[PDB]
Write an enzyme that holds these catalytic residues in place. Structure first.
Site, PDB file in Angstrom:
ATOM      1  N   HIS A 143       0.843  -1.195   0.000  1.00  0.00           N
ATOM      2  CA  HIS A 143       0.000   0.000   0.000  1.00  0.00           C
ATOM      3  C   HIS A 143       0.879   1.246   0.000  1.00  0.00           C
ATOM      4  CE1 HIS A 143      -2.343  -3.078   2.234  1.00  0.00           C
ATOM      5  NE2 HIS A 143      -3.417  -2.525   1.700  1.00  0.00           N
ATOM      6  N   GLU A 203     -10.909  -6.583  -4.854  1.00  0.00           N
ATOM      7  CA  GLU A 203     -10.783  -7.618  -3.832  1.00  0.00           C
ATOM      8  C   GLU A 203     -12.044  -7.619  -2.986  1.00  0.00           C
ATOM      9  OE1 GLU A 203      -8.117  -8.329   0.150  1.00  0.00           O
ATOM     10  OE2 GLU A 203      -7.082  -7.756  -1.705  1.00  0.00           O
ATOM     11  N   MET A 236       2.407  -5.902  -8.035  1.00  0.00           N
ATOM     12  CA  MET A 236       1.097  -5.393  -7.657  1.00  0.00           C
ATOM     13  C   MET A 236       1.306  -4.280  -6.638  1.00  0.00           C
ATOM     14  SD  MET A 236      -1.332  -5.493  -4.993  1.00  0.00           S
ATOM     15  CE  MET A 236      -1.340  -7.103  -4.219  1.00  0.00           C
ATOM     16  N   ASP A 242     -11.544 -12.433  10.347  1.00  0.00           N
ATOM     17  CA  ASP A 242     -10.524 -12.693   9.319  1.00  0.00           C
ATOM     18  C   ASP A 242      -9.211 -13.090   9.985  1.00  0.00           C
ATOM     19  OD1 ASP A 242      -9.175 -12.690   6.827  1.00  0.00           O
ATOM     20  OD2 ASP A 242      -9.079 -10.501   6.736  1.00  0.00           O
ATOM     21  N   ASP A 291      -1.322 -12.995   1.477  1.00  0.00           N
ATOM     22  CA  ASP A 291      -1.834 -11.934   2.341  1.00  0.00           C
ATOM     23  C   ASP A 291      -2.131 -12.623   3.672  1.00  0.00           C
ATOM     24  OD1 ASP A 291      -2.932  -9.698   3.486  1.00  0.00           O
ATOM     25  OD2 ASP A 291      -4.705  -9.612   2.192  1.00  0.00           O
ATOM     26  N   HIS A 299     -11.486 -14.756   2.721  1.00  0.00           N
ATOM     27  CA  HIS A 299     -12.648 -13.875   2.602  1.00  0.00           C
ATOM     28  C   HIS A 299     -13.872 -14.640   2.116  1.00  0.00           C
ATOM     29  CE1 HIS A 299     -10.028  -9.990   2.298  1.00  0.00           C
ATOM     30  NE2 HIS A 299      -9.810 -10.687   3.398  1.00  0.00           N
ATOM     31  N   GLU A 311      -9.566 -13.628  -2.188  1.00  0.00           N
ATOM     32  CA  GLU A 311      -8.757 -14.113  -1.068  1.00  0.00           C
ATOM     33  C   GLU A 311      -9.406 -15.340  -0.454  1.00  0.00           C
ATOM     34  OE1 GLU A 311      -7.548 -12.365   3.276  1.00  0.00           O
ATOM     35  OE2 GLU A 311      -6.662 -11.368   1.540  1.00  0.00           O
ATOM     36  N   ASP A 366      -6.349 -14.702   8.614  1.00  0.00           N
ATOM     37  CA  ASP A 366      -5.123 -14.491   7.823  1.00  0.00           C
ATOM     38  C   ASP A 366      -4.003 -15.433   8.279  1.00  0.00           C
ATOM     39  OD1 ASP A 366      -6.335 -12.504   6.227  1.00  0.00           O
ATOM     40  OD2 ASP A 366      -5.409 -10.851   7.313  1.00  0.00           O
ATOM     41  N   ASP A 383       2.291   1.910   3.401  1.00  0.00           N
ATOM     42  CA  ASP A 383       3.327   1.004   3.915  1.00  0.00           C
ATOM     43  C   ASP A 383       4.717   1.526   3.588  1.00  0.00           C
ATOM     44  OD1 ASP A 383       1.298  -0.812   4.650  1.00  0.00           O
ATOM     45  OD2 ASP A 383       1.465  -1.885   2.733  1.00  0.00           O
ATOM     46  N   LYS A 399     -14.709  -8.791   0.118  1.00  0.00           N
ATOM     47  CA  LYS A 399     -14.705  -9.299   1.490  1.00  0.00           C
ATOM     48  C   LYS A 399     -16.111  -9.088   2.014  1.00  0.00           C
ATOM     49  CE  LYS A 399     -12.137  -9.099   5.866  1.00  0.00           C
ATOM     50  NZ  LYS A 399     -11.306  -8.216   6.752  1.00  0.00           N
ATOM     51  N   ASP A 414      -5.014 -13.910  -3.728  1.00  0.00           N
ATOM     52  CA  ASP A 414      -4.453 -13.793  -2.379  1.00  0.00           C
ATOM     53  C   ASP A 414      -4.625 -15.116  -1.642  1.00  0.00           C
ATOM     54  OD1 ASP A 414      -3.764 -11.122  -2.769  1.00  0.00           O
ATOM     55  OD2 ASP A 414      -5.158 -10.320  -1.301  1.00  0.00           O
TER      56      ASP A 414
HETATM   57 MG   LIG Z   1      -6.209  -9.590   0.720  1.00  0.00          MG
HETATM   58 MG   LIG Z   2      -8.049 -11.340   5.055  1.00  0.00          MG
END
Ligand SMILES: [Mg+2]
Ligand SMILES: [Mg+2]
Ligand SMILES: [Mg+2]
Ligand SMILES: [Mg+2]
Ligand SMILES: [Mg+2]
Ligand SMILES: [Mg+2]
Ligand SMILES: [Mg+2]
Ligand SMILES: [Mg+2]
Lengths: 385, 385, 385, 385
Positions: free
Chosen positions: B52, B179, B86, B253, B285, B218, B215, B255, B55, B181, B243
């Site tokens: 991002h 993306e 990406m 979530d 991710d 998700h 993802e 992850d 980041d 979710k 992802d």
């Molecule tokens: Mg993601």
């Molecule tokens: Mg996630």
């Protein structure tokens, strides 16, 4: 809160006619004659009924037996003023459909599924239906290697394209609506939500002939927001029909009467349908619980209609309240309806108030006032205003 | 099972860089310098990294500070051979985005969201990214009256159309991936699944510029079958990016590292990606659990790659097994790939073997042999073959 | 529908004091002084407040700083008439608790968790609390090998037994309440539901000192019926305290204001609490959404109380309606309260009307009349009676 | 991986005997004679079978017909060496049980449920069963007013107390196991999880006669961790029996063969059962999917046993690996098994290293090393070690 046929409330024959068999139990009620269901629903104030082919004409019937089942049914419609706005095909009960109809692995089953469907499209047009629903309840899998999903979607597109070619060549005025469901009776069902169905339709040869028939309980079986999905269907211009019932969260398909289950979601659904001017049938796909006798069946059906009419009153009172109208402005719903950049891309890039001189901390400090708005909505729902 | 950069494994800076703050707890690890993350990921065998804007360049940075953050980052890429395939925008952390970016009720926030995005598209192209991801994590609502979803979808389409006009007019070779979710951090998020995102894209002015970035975790947050949704994205020609992580069912979530969570779903996902010839990045991710120190961070990242390579081996052995190939024929996967009616509609209607003379009981008695096939798949996964 | 302190409504300092940090976003509101929260809650009609140690006394405070934080707090209680009926320990925010407090794998952390708890029990008694709550939010695991659950339950029993020995030896009049939650922030949390907590208590050395503190949203995070679980806690004599809020199904812990989420479940909860004569605090563990400014915080807190009082009115009107009383008899709720066999086992075995001469078909044909009863309940909730 | 009767694998008659009727479909397989099921299961290597009364003796049978059904069954057990370690009562299929057996609102139904149960307890003892299972599948409600849960728990306790008085007075050596399930076929079922059942047992007059019979898929229907719940049952000394199958998340009860569904959860379950020395039957309560013919039924049953034996091998290899034993020490599983304060309360209060001089930052910095341990577990499961 008394319904009239102008409210366009409709019921499937299989709903009040459900005998109460579930995976762990035998039937608790005798079978209903379709003619009796038409008469009793008309006295409750319904507008019409819907059917699967196999609800009306027992599977395996001769052509003569078929004639007389239809004749009796048509006389009851004439004798009551009831309409038939929707019909659909049973491609899930008979053992031949245990791996699907349109996407069965066996090619001869897929051809038979198409012929069984086409025969009932003719009957639906004869009875005046304007929408033909497809619920692919057996299209799916319990295990990963059983079904190549890309080949299955090829076969599903092929089937719906052929049905569109048939109705075009016959000159029929009928449209198709796909009913999604995420699971049950298959472990996973293809096209599992409103979104997946809408995306699939855009790949058909004649997309204008196809829309969706979403069901309250089915989207909630995936934990999704049902009014949000209906709003996306309306935005796409694809809400051809709707199935109303109740569901208590993520579990087996309960098919409770409308208004049971998630009550606030039912309120926001009625608000949306009435505000957007949805003019199709208000169809109930529900099952009176097997605890009930026939008096309880008709009480449960009446409750479907009553709850819609109560929520309609409360939603209209909410939107007409001057204090609600000012709360909506306080939360900037008026600004959400305004274009972000009707001035165009170049003007946006040149606008220093949009970035270089934008005060992000002053904007971040602005409260949205959503909780006061939601408590006004709660007060209206409960009749505390 | 050692990864090489030819395996195209990529990681977000925010993944190994997660300091461990969750809703109930403070950080357990110090912040990582992006330069250190690039170096350590290169030694593990990764192909590249993603970011991002926020980041890489701390929010509020001057143009001079921005220059030098990018310069340091580019030197680490040159010093390691790492790529940047990406990039994406942070439109969720700052308080100004508490009601959304592209669909915030406040119009001045929406314009700022667009300008923040466009600035990072330029940087992404400079660094060589081919895909630009949009995750609208704040687009949604906790209550029903806060967000008119039809107006919100109008605003979302307006934003993505303007971004497409920008990249076209600049002559950029980059594509967009949305993306989805279903929820978290908003009560419900707009475009909640792969299906809803695919349907939305078909309403944009230039649909060819937009695909999806699904993802694992998700789609499983809605109880959906992730390989099934990926298959529909591939069928539509829209799988631009993916992802990979793990998730244990319907809850927050998680992850988790890839291969944790639903292991059989990971096996069928790798089987599908490799069989269909997906050639994009294998992006992770994920968040190393906050129980871990930095040695545990790199062990968790290495595990992502190892588990993909083990599943790839087992899926290839499954498809190459002559006994599996005959089981697939026994279950008629070959017939599923054959057209239902290449002979056309009129021939189908005239074919008495498809209806009048079809033996439904003989067809219904044919077992599908799915359980033997699935146990062969289980034996291959576990290395018991 | 105006609350008075006689309604025993209470709020945690951490509720109206939540600054709005979530896993993906920074705070949107400044920190509240506990003294200001006490004053504002008193003007809304609350009865009292609750605290974690670390809400009142910042972690790491010297003994002198601690004195003066307590002194300021006590003056605000004296200046408002507010009570402190419950307190609890923060064993989840500090990084030292990343693997738990009472069941951390490291033994030195477990001893520190006990000492941190005992210090706050003394303070709670000084402030007049009658209940001490334990929420073991970090007790659990993300992976299977990290935590031997039998050893962990040994350590959890050891901790609660030592706390019971401490309060007994000091002569304190305080009781403990365990708050269950199924997941978040750990992948799975030990004692995940009301049932698991009740079963665990029966294995402690002094079971009479321990009960449960169930939360609406936590049981709904496992898809369970919250009024049903409360009824089992009341039946066991263990409902020492209760946490009220709202939750929209199986997802992250939303902590919406009470009455939001599952509205019908809130109605049946209030009906049960008032009918059983629950006389403890009505405590709200909720978070005003981070979309709100401080005016929205106090509007959301006021809404908690208003919704309880509206539901109390509707539940009382339902039970007092003569037509509801006859419907309850029609559905045989009176027979459910009668013993099955007060005549004893031998008489039951000798009773031919109970088996040999029981007419099962006549009994099976009796409708239960549940749907008419439920629509009467719906009419009362909505004020359509 | 070949089973022998020493592995104590057992199957219900209703499992391989399921004809394939589901809520939306008719049967796909003919009925099996119990004698044929005993013979075929013995050739696959099973240890024994289980039954409901109505599986063995058709409902409504005369006493003479009953004699001869039992006689035929006993000859097949003698002719094969198969055992009958568990039996149970069908209190859910017949319409008379539509509102429950032990907690039906109608008192005459409750008495009939008890007499039907007692008659089958006698038969179970005659056939040598050591455990008698109760699954109260109809005990529950679809709506809130239909069932006062405190009165229902009074009636449930009364029924189980009477059954305990019967077995005591007859001098029988049999124990009871309660099987929980959260929902389906009722909207919510009483005693919905392992925890609720364990807590209820502690209120019975003779708690030593009652334990639990948990099912993999049932706890996963509430999103719970099944190995965690089994560990609490073992800790309480109440795991009398266990039902093994597979389930893909929160949805209808799938009853997939064991090892399907959540594969990692199956691995950690086998690890726990074998490490704790569980010595009861390994019972499979599963349904071969209705896609299968009879060859697929026996392939699915064989798969249940094969998957248990593969996971047993991998779990034993994991625990015996010296590198896993050192990883367990690295993560301090050895310290979790050590008492927190065997020195007692006064010593703990006087220990300045437990609070005043405890270095919280040094303790918080220690990584738990859980991710390396979990990847070692994953490598062992997949046979990559
Ligand atoms: Mg993601
Ligand atoms: Mg996630
Ligand atoms: Mg349904
Ligand atoms: Mg429907
Ligand atoms: Mg909570
Ligand atoms: Mg709480
Ligand atoms: Mg089951
Ligand atoms: Mg079972």
């Amino acid at each position: 809160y008394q319904p009239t046929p102008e409210d366009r409330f409709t019921f499937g024959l299989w709903t009040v006619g459900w005998q109460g068999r579930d995976p762990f139990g035998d039937a608790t009620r005798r079978a209903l004659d379709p003619v009796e269901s038409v008469r009793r629903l008309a006295e409750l104030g319904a507008h019409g009924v819907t059917f699967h082919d196999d609800d009306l004409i027992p599977f395996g019937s001769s052509d003569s037996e078929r004639e007389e089942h239809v004749k009796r049914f048509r006389q009851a419609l004439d004798d009551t003023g009831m309409k038939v706005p929707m019909a659909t095909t049973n491609l899930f009960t008979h053992p031949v459909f245990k791996d699907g109809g349109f996407t069965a692995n066996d090619r001869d089953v897929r051809r038979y599924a198409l012929r069984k469907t086409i025969r009932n499209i003719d009957l639906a047009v004869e009875l005046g239906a304007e929408t033909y629903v497809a619920w692919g309840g057996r299209e799916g899998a319990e295990s990963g290697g059983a079904k190549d999903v890309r080949d299955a979607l090829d076969r599903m597109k092929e089937a719906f394209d052929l049905l569109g070619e048939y109705v075009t060549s016959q000159g029929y005025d009928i449209r198709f609506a796909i009913e999604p469901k995420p699971n049950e009776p298959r472990g996973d069902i293809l096209l599992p939500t409103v979104g997946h169905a809408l995306a699939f339709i855009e790949r058909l040869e004649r997309p204008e002939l196809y829309g969706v028939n979403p069901e309250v309980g089915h989207e909630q079986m995936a934990g999704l927001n049902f009014p949000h999905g209906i709003a996306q269907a309306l935005w796409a211009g694809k809400l051809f029909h709707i199935d109303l019932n109740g569901q208590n969260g993520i579990k087996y398909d309960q098919d409770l009467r409308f208004g049971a289950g998630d009550l606030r979601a039912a309120f926001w659904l009625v608000d949306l349908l009435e505000s957007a001017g949805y003019s199709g049938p208000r169809h109930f796909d529900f099952k009176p619980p097997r605890t009930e006798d026939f008096d309880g069946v008709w009480a449960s059906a009446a409750g479907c209609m009553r709850n819609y009419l109560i929520l309609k009153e409360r939603a209209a009172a909410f939107r007409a309240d001057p204090e609600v109208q000012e709360a909506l402005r306080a939360s900037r719903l008026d600004e959400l309806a305004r274009p972000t950049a009707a001035d165009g891309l170049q003007a946006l890039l040149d606008d220093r108030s949009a970035f270089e001189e934008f005060d992000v901390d002053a904007a971040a400090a602005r409260g949205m006032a959503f909780e006061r708005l939601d408590q006004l909505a709660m007060d209206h729902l409960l009749g505390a205003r």
